[PDB]
Every structure is written in structure tokens, then in C-alpha cells.
């Protein structure tokens, strides 16, 4: 069905569409001259020097909360690219990026991450899991769920290339809750399964099974966003002068 | 090794006809109507006649005794689940602790997977095939319990609509035991060395006997997200309805607790 196509195809809307690819990120994470040293983010007098180079742990998550708005904008950039996905129902086009935009997130966060940290503003920081894990409760562990998936993850090896095809997958998923029309988003998910399991085979000759291994950490991608919206709940019966971003206020609700 | 993958999918096959004696072949000729025939229990007349007609090993308000009697059922099931595992080449040889956490991690996602083949869109079979319950018998009940069944009959019907066999499921239900991502597993690599032929033997299988039905394997594990998240939400509101009820012997909730 042009498989090797497609595969590029997604491949050039992903760089297109997402600032910083994995390849940079680890080229950032590993000190390659290709790119620059991130600023270290680690303790509270660090962080402040960070972010100029009232509650910290709010204005963190609030952060991380307005960066995600911009990938939410990225993502869906990228989903206009995927064939077949502009010509799916509104209402369906809605759904599926309300439902796949937070596994998204996740599997790209990964790319970002170490089992020490996270890079920040486009790679130019850091910041240590040790230190978000030592902010207040509760949001000295919301993101340590995000890293545990990173760990295993990366072990995968994916690259860009393989993350492209992926990342679209998620998207077209006719299991997601209110859609109208199943089968067009089933047709055009086929389309990119094959195309996954030839990338794959072709970039990952030595790697048995890792089409089934990769499709199975969609299982981790899905509990986290469970467990996220777990502990927006939490916060809300907890926190009170907290606001939340139009955008995210929309996909959350009512999400699960 | 092609002849050797379809060896084992016998043999698993083979073990699960043994370890599980109401099989989806068996369910889908009750559902269908392929002949015995169920009792209904449609309504609360027919509950009260069903607990005298059918044995019931759970003979308190209704909705309690009927999420009693699922729980009663499910730890029965486990039995089965363990009688099943323990033949999967490999599994015996394992460490003990890490067979241990394979199956406590492991035999709810089995119990909501071979649940789907007890259901369609009407309802579900009861006590081996010898009732069936309606869904709209179950959405009736007073909340909690009302919303406590939906969401299984909502994964049923998506899972159903692939169309899996006995021989197809018994190697899906091996693979998910064989999971090596489940925390607190002392040794990963015997786990996934058996996950990987499990898998190269699912994805043959399926390629075999649904031959003109694309990307099933890839389909069918995908399926498993749904399936953790039913799972996960099973035991939150089992954590509302324990902290909340109080229809819910000492001797007897020691057995009945856990899974
Ligand atoms: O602005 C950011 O790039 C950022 C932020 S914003 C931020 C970071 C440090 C100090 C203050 C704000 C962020 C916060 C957390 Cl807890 C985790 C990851 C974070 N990131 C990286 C990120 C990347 C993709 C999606 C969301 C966040
Ligand atoms: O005892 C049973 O066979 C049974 C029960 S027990 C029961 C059924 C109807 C009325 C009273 C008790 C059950 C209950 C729900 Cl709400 C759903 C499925 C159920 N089943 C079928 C079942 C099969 C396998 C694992 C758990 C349950």
C-alpha cells in the first residue's frame, strides 16, 4: 500500500511539525558538539537561577501544563498530515485527538528523558527527577509514573523515524469512546500497522518481536493517563486557587 | 521453526480444553442457540426464581448477592487460570516468587478476556451456561452496582467483533501471563524468552486461521489497553463498594478477598 511512502511521508510532517526530535534531545542528553549543554535545574535555588537563565511546585505543574498546550497544538498539526485524517467526520477528528493527544504527549516526553531527569524549554534545561520527586505533596510524584514508562521505553531503541509511524497509530485508534464512524479510522490504522511492522523489520532487523513489544507499551501509555487524571482529581479536592488552561480544560473533560 | 509454533499452539490448545470446561465454542452455541437451554433472569421475579432453579454456590439485598456470587465465581476461575499457566512450557521452571506475581498481575486480565466469550450485546452466561443474565437486568440495579457491569459489556462487544476461537484465545491468555513488564519480577529474561515464542506462535495462528483478517495480531494486542484500564477500574469501584457497603462470615471473606 506504498508502505515505505507513508513511512517518510510521516517521518517529514513529524519534523515538520515537532521543534525537537529525539535525535537532538539525545545528542542534548549526551553531550554530543552538535548541540549545547543544558542548564541544570536540581534544587529551589537552582530552579530560580533557571528560570531566569508564587508556590514553586504550582508554578512547575503549570509549566508543564502550558507546554503541553503547545504540544497539543503540535500534535494536531501533525494529525493533519496523517492520510485519510482530514477527511474523517469533525466530530471524529475531535474525538481521536482528545483521546490520543496525552499518550502523545508521553511517548514524546520519553524522547526527553534519562532515568535522572527531563530537558526544559526546548533542551536548554534540565531538570533532575530527584528534585521534582522532593517538591510538596501531592506534586512530589506526578511525574515519576512518566519516567518509570521513559525507562522502559527507550530500552526499545526507537528513533524518529520508527516514533513518526507510531505516534500516528495512537492517533487513529477506532476503540476510542463516542466515535461515529469506526470503521474509516480502523481502514486507515491498517494502513499505518503495516507500515509500522515494515519499518520496523527493515530499521530493526536484529530486534525479535519488537512490533508486538512496542504495541504492547500502548498498554503503560494508557495507565498513565488513567493515573493522570487520577491525580488532577486529587488536586482539585485539594488545591484551591489553581487554574487550568481552555485547551486542557477541554480535553479533560470528560476524559475517563 | 514453523512445525515446533504450531506444536506448541496444540499443546496450549490442548491444556486449555482440559483447564477450562466452558470453552467461547460451547458459550457461542448457547448464544447463538445452536441445539439445554439457559434460564433467563431478566428481572428481579426471575432472580428469585433462578437462585431456586440453579445451584449457586453464593445461596442479603439483590445487587449485593449477585456482585457476591461474580467475586465467589471469579476466585473459582483462578484455579483454573493457575491450572493453566502451570502448563505453559517454561512457566513451572520459573522462579516461585515471579510465578506468583505473573498470576496475581496476571489472572484478572484473563477473568475480563474469557468473561467476553460468556457475552454478547443482551447479556451475559451465568453458572456454565446453565442461565443467562440480561444486560438490562444489570443496568437496573441501584448505583453502585448499576454502572459496575457496563463498561465489560462495552470491551465484550469490540473484543467479540474479532471473532477469536478457543485456539486463538489459549495462546492471547498465555501471552498475558507472560508478562515481564509486571513490577516487582525478580528475572525478566526466562519471562520474555517464553513471551517471544508465545507471540511468534499467537501471530502465526492467527495469520493460519484468520487468513483474510489484516493486522489481527496487531489488533488483538492492542486490545490489551482496554483491557488493563477495565481492570483498573474494576478495582477502584471493588474499593468503593468494600469501604461503603455493608451487605459485603469472617472465615468465609478470608477466602473471598482477593483473587
Ligand atoms: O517548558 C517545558 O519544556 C517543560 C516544563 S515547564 C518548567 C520546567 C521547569 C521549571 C519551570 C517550568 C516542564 C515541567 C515538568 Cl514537571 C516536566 C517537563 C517540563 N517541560 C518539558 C515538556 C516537554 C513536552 C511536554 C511538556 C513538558
Ligand atoms: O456465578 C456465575 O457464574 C456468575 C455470576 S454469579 C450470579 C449471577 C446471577 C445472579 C446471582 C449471582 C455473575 C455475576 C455477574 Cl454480575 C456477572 C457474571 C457472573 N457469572 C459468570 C462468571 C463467569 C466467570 C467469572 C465470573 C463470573
Known amino acids: 500500500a506504498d508502505l515505505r511512502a507513508l ?3 510521516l517521518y517529514d510532517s513529524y519534523i515538520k511539525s515537532f521543534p ?5 534531545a539525545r545528542a542534548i542528553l549526551t553531550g554530543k558538539t552538535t548541540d549545547k549543554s543544558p542548564f541544570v535545574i536540581y534544587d529551589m535555588n537552582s530552579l530560580m537561577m533557571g528560570e531566569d537563565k508564587k508556590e514553586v511546585a504550582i508554578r512547575i ?5 502550558f507546554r503541553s498546550v503547545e504540544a497539543v497544538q503540535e500534535i494536531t498539526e501533525y494529525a493533519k498530515s496523517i492520510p485519510g485524517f482530514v477527511n474523517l467526520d469533525l466530530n471524529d477528528q475531535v474525538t481521536l485527538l482528545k483521546y490520543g493527544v496525552h499518550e502523545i504527549i508521553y511517548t514524546m516526553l520519553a524522547s526527553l528523558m534519562n532515568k535522572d531527569g527531563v530537558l526544559i524549554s526546548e533542551g536548554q534545561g534540565f531538570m533532575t527527577r530527584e528534585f521534582l520527586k522532593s517538591l ?8 515519576e509514573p512518566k519516567f518509570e514508562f521513559a525507562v522502559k521505553f527507550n530500552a526499545l531503541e526507537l528513533d524518529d523515524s520508527d516514533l513518526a509511524i507510531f ?4 492517533i ?26 515494515l519499518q520496523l523489520k527493515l530499521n530493526h532487523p536484529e530486534s525479535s518481536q519488537l512490533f508486538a513489544k512496542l504495541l504492547q507499551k500502548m498498554t503503560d501509555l494508557r495507565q498513565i493517563v488513567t493515573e493522570h487524571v487520577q491525580l488532577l482529581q486529587v488536586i482539585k479536592k485539594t488545591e484551591t486557587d489553581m487554574s487550568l488552561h481552555p485547551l486542557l480544560q477541554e480535553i479533560y473533560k470528560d476524559l475517563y
Do not use: W
Open 61 to 65: 505543574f503549570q509549566g508543564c501544563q
Open 167 to 170: 505516534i500516528a497509530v495512537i
Open 172 to 197: 487513529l485508534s477506532g476503540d476510542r469512546p463516542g466515535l461515529l464512524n469506526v470503521k474509516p479510522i480502523e481502514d486507515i490504522q491498517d494502513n499505518l500497522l503495516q507500515a509500522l511492522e
Open 136 to 143: 510538596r505533596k501531592p506534586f512530589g510524584d506526578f511525574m
Open 20 to 24: 525537537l526530535t529525539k535525535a537532538k
Open 7 to 9: 513511512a517518510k511521508h
